[PDB]
Amino acid sequence: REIKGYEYQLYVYASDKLFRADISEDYKTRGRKLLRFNGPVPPP
Amino acid sequence: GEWEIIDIGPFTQNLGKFAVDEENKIGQYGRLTFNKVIRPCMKKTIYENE
Structure with a gap:
């Protein structure tokens, strides 16, 4: 943040x-937050 | 800020699991079973400037 x-x-x-x-x-806190999740996508 | 690639070891596989579990509480995709993290995995580090 x-x-x-x-x-x-x-x-x-x-x-x-x-x-x-x-x-x-x-x-500092080790605060993970999920931000965006989208799919399915084409493989890289 | 800086940008770098990182390796898919059990550190990266963990952020895999967290991302899926977290989606599943807001489960727009129904509900999903995690399977694996593939390459590439990018990691930005931010510093005091915005």
Whole structure:
């Protein structure tokens, strides 16, 4: 939540389908928050 | 800020599981069984400037 953390983008396989997931991660608290989840997508 | 690629070890497989479990509470896709994290996995690190 603070420009002091991370952001991950992911390609997750769930139920034989491919999805896009962007997660956040606060440097101090280790507060992960799911941000966007969309799919299915074409494989990279 | 910085940007880098990371490897799909059990750290990345964990953010896989969290993303699915978290979708399933808001389950617009019905409900889903996680299967795996594929490459590439990107990771931004933000610093004090917005």
